[PDB]
Design an enzyme around this catalytic site. Structure first.
Site, short mmCIF file in Angstrom:
data_model
loop_
_atom_site.label_atom_id
_atom_site.label_comp_id
_atom_site.label_asym_id
_atom_site.label_seq_id
_atom_site.Cartn_x
_atom_site.Cartn_y
_atom_site.Cartn_z
N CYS B 152 0.87 -1.19 0.00
CA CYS B 152 0.00 0.00 0.00
C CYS B 152 0.88 1.21 0.00
O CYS B 152 0.46 2.23 -0.54
CB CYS B 152 -0.91 0.01 1.22
SG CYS B 152 -0.17 -0.64 2.73
N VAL B 156 0.06 4.21 -2.50
CA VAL B 156 -0.28 5.55 -2.03
C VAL B 156 0.69 6.58 -2.61
O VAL B 156 0.26 7.64 -3.08
CB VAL B 156 -0.30 5.59 -0.49
CG1 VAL B 156 -0.39 7.02 0.00
CG2 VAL B 156 -1.47 4.78 0.04
S1 CLF Z 1 5.15 -2.65 6.51
FE1 CLF Z 1 4.12 -3.32 8.44
S2 CLF Z 1 2.87 -5.03 7.69
FE2 CLF Z 1 3.34 -3.86 5.81
S3 CLF Z 1 1.39 -2.44 5.27
FE3 CLF Z 1 3.18 -1.47 6.54
S4 CLF Z 1 2.58 -1.62 8.75
FE4 CLF Z 1 1.51 -3.22 7.51
FE5 CLF Z 1 -0.53 -4.10 5.60
S5 CLF Z 1 -2.58 -3.80 4.32
FE6 CLF Z 1 -1.30 -5.42 3.29
S6 CLF Z 1 0.17 -6.07 4.90
FE7 CLF Z 1 1.20 -4.30 3.84
S7 CLF Z 1 0.10 -4.26 1.85
FE8 CLF Z 1 -0.42 -2.72 3.47
#
Ligand code: CLF
Ligand code: ICS
Ligand code: CLF
Ligand SMILES: [Fe+3]
Ligand SMILES: [Fe+3]
Lengths: 477, 522, 522, 477
Positions: B152, B156
């Site tokens: 994401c 974004v």
């Molecule tokens: S580095 Fe860590 S786990 Fe990654 S997003 Fe960021 S806080 Fe979360 Fe989340 S919804 Fe799916 S798993 Fe990512 S692509 Fe985004």
């Protein structure tokens, strides 16, 4: 042995990388020398991972929500953002707790804002505020809310601290905004730091003016123990037999009340230095509470630690410590007598996050098992300063080791057992090497204390000497 | 204390008297825990109907969701091609979570890489990360193809995958001939099934779009099968076996069954089997393309009908009796191969099983959840058996899918008590099963907690869970099972009827109280 | 009373207040029931070691046996040949019981006839009954072969099967060329497996003994497989599949898998598939003969080595990793066909499953019972998994089998706490599981009552039952499962590990008491 | 329907048999005429079965051990002989009971002498005496022992009545020898007779001189109800609501005390005339207790039977019967209103043992379903005398019907439902016709009384209108 052989192995493994990647990775692999006390001259740590090398590291959100804030049971933690992170981190960590889930405890539940395209384009502060309203509506017995930010929250400029302040003022509730976006930092260490700063800023000092709690000269607070499979409990009972009073427990089976009462204790016992040294040092400066590191892995380390803790109190605590050591001596002696012959001479390789690659060495040596190599996912140079004196000469040390690197090192060294995470488990089992999960204790435990030593020895023997490892070759092959 | 002859793990070690006393001391001293009567009153209130209305008034808060994000499905799709490395452009925490999820479900190694974008990438983009990651991945793990999805963060900040990959090729970081298909997988859109769809569409477009001139429909005498997001290896196996039995040439696109089921013979195989690039290139020459799970393969359907010029049949997921029959008829019509006697015998065997178990299956009430195609197929099968689906929940479903499921339910008298919920989570389902109690739940491992809650209300209120779906973490080797075809129907029927019989045995084990019905023969 | 919207069967209708009160006054008025404290004290006494010592002193009383009589196995053997009618010479109540037993296990039609011998046949014999029965059976059900076994009445009165069949043929009741193999099956000797052995030896002798002049060993390049008394269709299927994958010509003698698994397509097929008479006649031309369950095929082995002159290999039952490997190696040596890569992959996958589940399987204590070959194979597999068999019971075993199982146990460190009992019944096993509690029981449905008994002592004393064996009445479609080969090993491993995990989940479901160990991931 | 067509069908089915078998089977098949009262002129019953024709009949051991003596809970029943008999009959019959199994109740248990070669050659009387001693040792709370003989016991010169006499005299216990050898008779009916004679000779008259039991003018004894799925219970409650006192029920959920107390009752209510008419007539002759038949299958039969039993007593019992009928009227009316439209016009065929082929017709008619065919495995001519006036015109009647015969009749008439035992259940299921087990109620029940009527209607609906019956044809064939 054969330090030169280990160096040649490191070079041969590194040969496959491109020039920049090889140059970067050369600094993160080292041959141990116990006489060296400055690991900066030997290894480098806490640096960015090389792109496209299959690293094992996590993100700051994992270090804040999954590690520090998550075990807090009477608090509701909102994974602010898309649905994936909370779902992947839901109940994946065995930080045990006692409570009625959904009524007064919320550890194993997944609270999220479930961001859509509209929330990304137009923001999510209004969604966050009215989500807090729904949370208070449906879970009246919660004792506070934390809001753990994910990557889009930092990216789209959501102003969550203002929302938290306004909503907390309007509901007279503790709402803690944590900026734990995954892109911040290089691993879970920055998540630990951000969570510690959030605890310091919004939770720790709420009872500074409250002088109601009764204090005793034997007040200790267990810091950095997350009660994986129950370890914290298996430690606390020992501290209970020594005559000490454990006012606070951070953060496994922890309550916000314990965090609030912590500044009233007389001593801090930091288990995981890596994750909570920040808060321990802050408490030392602000309140004058001394802190010490302790180790309850194996009979030798736990006896030494208990004596060290008893040394900071009067003679009665020392007498009780000697009594508890004498009381628990036969149990671990019998465990050693039963299991050490089955495990004498077995060589182990370890790769865990930031504390356990060095804390578990004593327990292995108590069963006559030598560690030929360790490493860390995200440790800092002080952690390596600590572990370099705890390993033997010419042992391998790896920082942020890649899958190919770790696989090649095992293929050459050929240890009898490997302790790492779930992402290496099946890889190494398919190569015919016994494997133990050192994060979740392979869904067993506890391993801390005298009670945990028996479980540790039994698990090590049952995995090392399992018949399944003798049947990987077909008789006709 | 521990006994060397009988060592206790956490359970039952922490039920010892000293541990219980220490825990009670901690709770009484430093927890400021709410009084137990207050806790019981609040729980009882959460089990009521007013709490259910307050829960269904939710619009911003999601509690216990039943879906994941797109890059998970993208990784699963990428793992199905020969010597293909999944490469998620963005942060590494996402990749760690994806690997942990898939490892805990399949209990197999899962390979995936990231370029580890950080705040510097948030300020200046992630082109350098993409270049270095592609170079390092190709040099180290030596894949034949790198399949690029996104997190994401990259979505974004608007990272341009096409420009980044093109510049990486031109600057020599990777060879120009190296296949690097890409797909945009925004996590704030849809769920993991949408990510699978996007990844497959990207791979197919990369391997086909510029080579449509020499393609003739029906030239290679094969039928393309697109499985979609599938987490049961038995389903791939059963589709392959059924198509081989009928004597039909086929090309199963995105087949991950080998890499997720590698043998343990002393060596680690990072890559195993998978769809070849030649299969992808020759796919437009097939007679037609069949989508096993059409309700999350809409973009793939659009691309196949628009570019490959294939008249994709309107088929439901081959689950149950009637839908498997329809799939077999359609494949026979497209290929010209008659249905052999073996499939007829298997179908008759399934019907015999139904006739044997109909007395125990009839009238049972089920609350089920999962993915749209899986949920609708399970509902169809339950209606085939005379069962009554009561609470049908699909978090990632849509209004068209809801209308289709409503049309399916209105076609059977057993669907008169059925209500379909879309966009709801497992907290909604907890309220539903507390207020309108079904006999059983069907779903993934996350439902176990719900059962626990019901058991807290009382034994007469407990709703046993049946683990069918994704992910299953608290059981071993269930991923080897089959849900499609007659074999899958037989497995589901056996599991359901034996769950009913086991619950009946448990309820009548009380001696001199309820054991008059503890029959030896059922 | 009953509610038209929710009608209750016996359970829980008889838990209503009026029914409970009516049972109460019945018991208090006219049952002269012993006082409840007396009943509890006597039950507790039955749970002690002194009661066990008294129980093991039994010499004349058998309580809850775990075996059947020979004609049942004879009927099962007869059902495995092409269009063959099992014909039991004696009384018809035996045939009714055999059919009921087999219908309740297989849930399939079972065909068998009798000559309905009565009091008169006790003073005149059953010659007329045999003649009329053979004529009527051939005229009505039109079989190609009638396989004759005996009940105990005929064995005690000493009816001469050979003379009766010869006289029936001579007097024109049946054609002289019509095959009527016979076997004496005394119910007071051995068990059902012995009856299977006797029936197979009779059929083979009938089809071979007088035509061995033109037989040359190894002329047809096939390997004969004798399965023995088998009640799992999956094992027939898996042996066929494993021999076909290896490219090995085979002749499966006594194959009942088709007639016991007929489809439901609107017509009743009395006969389906089966071993043909040409296969029986050409069996001496095979390279060798392999007995899958040698511990109840001793007479067949004697006949085959003595008459067919086949060097029958010394192979154990192909259960589990090592014994399946040994069977595959022996088949490869006999046939000259190398083991293909598919079997190697299947073996490696089984090993991967073992490595995945070893943490949960290790140290578990099992009390198991069943047939000798099945019991010994199960013990071997449990020793391969690191499990600890504690109570090994075989009611129909002998001293040589006990010595072999003891030698197997002495070859593993996990057999130090293992005891083998022969000639004991399920009451002995109840005493054993009360005094030396294991983790689980493995056996047929008859063990369920034992579990009930344990649950009466306490939830901490309950021993869960795992249903592997024969017969299984309280569950549906378990007879389709597989126990032989790598597939059978995989099924057994999955069943065991999931039983362990289900028990652990049940033990830790209580909220705020034991739920700290109610892990989502196991 | 179409009497001449039914005779033509009978002839066509009979053509396949040899001349002797065809001549014998011609006498066991009939076209029913309700005007005919003497069934001897149309059908012949209770004869030996034709060899090799796949009959459904059992043996005398099944009729004695499995039917009469088995449901008695506080008694221990020894299957004297080889091991098969008890194992096949263990817990195969759903005669429900309340008790502590293995301590004070032993119904689902298998006690056997497990005869070997040495017991056949040298006898088994000594083994029998030793077995009785062991039974008394291991089961001290048993209230009596019965010894059911199997075929070898009659064949060899075993003398069990003497052993029972001596052991009972020594042990002060009731030991009942039953000579139920399977070769005696042609079916389970002789087993019923032998069991009734054993009850009369050894159990029934022990309290002839004892007069301590308080008697009430409303004392009734249930006879011939074996509590299948709780059936007897569902009847007894109704008889309790009428103001009567049920001293004994034979033999489902029955105690030896009830059997002993039965000669004190004022009326006998015989459910199964076929199995226990012998004991009912003996009680009428010796003690003067009147007996009458009753039927609790369906609302109409239940109401008529209740009114008859009430007429056997004074005015208060009649008034209470009226109240119970009024109280239960809406419930069965609602059941009929819900289920009759879904079952109107459905035609059924039945093949059960001695009572149920005719006893359940009223329940089917109460749901608007016509019985076009019925038959008995082992009934006598009186059962058929009742059946003719129970059944309609031009319906088929069969006695000891064979598998081929029953299959051919079913294929011709083509009923909507078939009710028979387990041995025909799957045969008719594969032909695509709904089947209901009428012996064990297909592991459901009870079907007796007003409570049982709802279960009966629900089961008939769920089997008749199941979707599985519409899917036997593949769309391609
Ligand atoms: S580095 Fe860590 S786990 Fe990654 S997003 Fe960021 S806080 Fe979360 Fe989340 S919804 Fe799916 S798993 Fe990512 S692509 Fe985004
Ligand atoms: S006793 Fe008889 S065969 Fe009257 S032997 Fe049989 S439990 Fe049948 S028609 Mo099974 S004369 Fe009872 C009977 Fe009827 S076992 Fe049951 S159903 S009412
Ligand atoms: S007609 Fe009836 S059931 Fe038959 S034997 Fe005779 S009493 Fe018994 Fe028994 S052990 Fe087996 S099943 Fe028989 S052959 Fe003997
Ligand atoms: Fe695996
Ligand atoms: Fe069947």
């Amino acid at each position: 042995m054969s330090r030169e052989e280990v160096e040649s192995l490191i070079q041969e493994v590194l040969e496959v990388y491109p020039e920049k990647a090889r140059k970067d990775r050369n600094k993160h692999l080292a041959v141990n020398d116990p006489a060296v006390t400055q690991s900066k001259k030997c290894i480098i740590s806490n640096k960015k991972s090389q792109p496209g090398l299959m690293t094992i590291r996590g993100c700051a959100y994992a270090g804040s929500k999954g590690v520090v804030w998550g075990p807090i049971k009477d608090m509701i933690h909102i994974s602010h953002g898309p649905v994936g992170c909370g779902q992947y981190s839901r109940a994946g960590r065995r930080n045990y707790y006692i409570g009625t889930t959904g009524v007064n405890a919320f550890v194993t539940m997944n609270f999220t804002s479930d961001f859509q395209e509209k929330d990304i384009v137009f923001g999510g502060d209004k969604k966050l505020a009215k989500l807090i309203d729904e949370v208070e509506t449906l879970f009246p017995l919660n004792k506070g809310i934390s809001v753990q930010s994910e990557c889009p929250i930092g990216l789209i400029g959501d102003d969550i601290e203002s929302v938290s302040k306004v909503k907390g003022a309007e509901l007279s509730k503790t709402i803690v905004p944590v900026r734990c976006e995954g892109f911040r930092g290089v691993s879970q260490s920055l998540g630990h730091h951000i969570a510690n700063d959030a605890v310091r800023d919004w939770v720790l000092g709420k009872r500074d003016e409250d002088t109601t709690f009764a204090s005793t000269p034997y007040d200790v607070a267990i810091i950095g123990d997350y009660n994986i499979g129950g370890d914290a409990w298996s430690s606390r009972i020992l501290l209970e037999e020594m005559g000490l009073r454990c006012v606070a427990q951070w953060s496994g089976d922890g309550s916000i009340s314990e965090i609030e009462l912590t500044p009233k204790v007389k001593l801090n016992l930091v288990h995981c230095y890596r994750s909570m040294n920040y808060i321990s040092r802050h408490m030392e400066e602000k309140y004058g509470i001394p802190w010490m590191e302790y180790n309850f892995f194996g009979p030798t380390k736990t006896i030494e630690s208990l004596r060290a803790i008893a040394a900071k109190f009067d003679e009665s605590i020392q007498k009780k410590c000697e009594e508890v050591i004498a009381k628990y001596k036969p149990e671990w002696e019998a465990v050693v007598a039963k299991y050490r012959p089955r495990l004498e001479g077995k060589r182990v390789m370890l790769y865990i996050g930031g504390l356990r690659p060095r804390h578990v060495i004593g327990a292995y040596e108590d069963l006559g098992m030598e560690v030929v190599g360790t490493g860390y996912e995200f440790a800092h140079n002080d952690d390596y300063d600590r572990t370099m004196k705890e390993m033997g000469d010419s042992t391998l040390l790896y920082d942020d080791v890649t899958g190919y690197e770790f696989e090649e090192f095992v293929k050459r060294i050929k240890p009898d057992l490997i302790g790492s995470g779930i992402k290496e488990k099946f890889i190494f089992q398919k190569m015919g090497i016994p494997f133990r999960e050192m994060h979740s204790w392979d869904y067993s435990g506890p391993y801390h204390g005298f009670d945990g030593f028996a479980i540790f020895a039994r698990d090590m023997d049952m995995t090392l000497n399992n018949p399944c490892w003798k049947k990987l070759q077909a008789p006709w092959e | 204390s521990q006994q060397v002859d009988k060592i206790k793990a956490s359970y039952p070690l922490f039920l010892d008297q000293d541990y219980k006393d220490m825990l009670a001391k901690k709770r009484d001293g430093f927890e400021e825990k709410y009084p137990q009567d207050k806790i019981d009153e609040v729980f009882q209130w959460t089990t009521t109907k007013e709490y259910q209305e307050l829960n269904f008034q939710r619009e911003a808060l999601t509690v216990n969701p039943a879906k994941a994000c797109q890059p998970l499905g993208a990784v699963l799709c990428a793992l199905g091609f020969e010597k293909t490395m999944p490469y998620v452009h963005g942060s590494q925490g996402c990749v760690a979570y994806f690997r942990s999820y898939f490892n805990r479900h399949f209990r197999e190694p899962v390979s995936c890489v990231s370029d580890s974008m950080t705040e510097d990438a948030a300020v200046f983009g992630g082109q350098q990360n993409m270049k270095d990651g592609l170079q390092n991945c190709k040099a180290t793990y030596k894949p034949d193809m790198i399949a690029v999805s996104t997190t994401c963060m990259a979505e974004v900040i608007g990272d341009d995958l096409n420009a980044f990959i093109n510049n990486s090729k031109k600057e020599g970081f990777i060879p120009d001939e190296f296949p690097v298909p890409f797909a945009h997988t925004p996590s704030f859109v849809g769920s993991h099934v949408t990510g699978w769809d996007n990844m497959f569409e990207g791979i197919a477009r990369y391997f086909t779009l510029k080579s449509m001139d020499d393609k003739v429909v029906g030239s290679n005498k094969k039928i393309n099968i697109v499985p979609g997001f599938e987490t049961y290896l038995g389903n791939f196996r059963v589709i392959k076996r059924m198509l081989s039995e009928m004597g039909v040439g086929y090309s199963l696109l995105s087949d991950p069954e080998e890499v997720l089921d590698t043998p343990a013979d002393g060596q680690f195989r990072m890559y195993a089997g998978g769809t070849t690039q030649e299969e992808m290139k020759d796919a437009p020459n097939a007679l037609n393309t069949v989508l096993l799970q059409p309700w999350h393969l809409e973009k793939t359907k659009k691309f196949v009908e628009g570019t490959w010029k294939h008249e994709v049949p309107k088929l439901n997921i081959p689950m149950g009796l009637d839908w498997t029959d329809e799939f077999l008829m359609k494949v026979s019509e497209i290929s010209g191969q008659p249905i052999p006697a073996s499939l007829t015998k298997e179908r008759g065997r399934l019907v015999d099983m139904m006739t044997d178990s109909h007395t125990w299956l009839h009238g049972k009430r089920f609350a089920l959840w999962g993915d749209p195609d899986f949920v609708m197929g399970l509902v169809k099968f339950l209606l085939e058996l005379g069962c009554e689906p009561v609470h049908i929940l699909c978090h990632n479903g849509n209004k068209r899918w809801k209308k289709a499921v409503d049309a399916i339910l209105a076609a059977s008298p057993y669907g008169k008590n059925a209500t379909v919920y879309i966009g709801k989570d497992l907290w909604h389902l907890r309220s539903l099963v507390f207020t309108d109690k079904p006999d059983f739940m069907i779903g993934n491992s996350y439902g176990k907690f719900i059962q626990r809650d019901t058991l807290h209300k009382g034994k007469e209120f407990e709703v046993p869970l049946i683990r069918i779906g994704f992910p299953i973490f608290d059981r071993h080797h269930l991923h080897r099972s089959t849900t499609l075809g007659y074999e899958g129907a037989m497995q589901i029927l056996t599991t359901l009827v034996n769950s009913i019989l086991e619950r009946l045995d448990e309820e009548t084990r009380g001696m001199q109280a309820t054991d008059y019905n503890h029959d030896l023969v059922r």
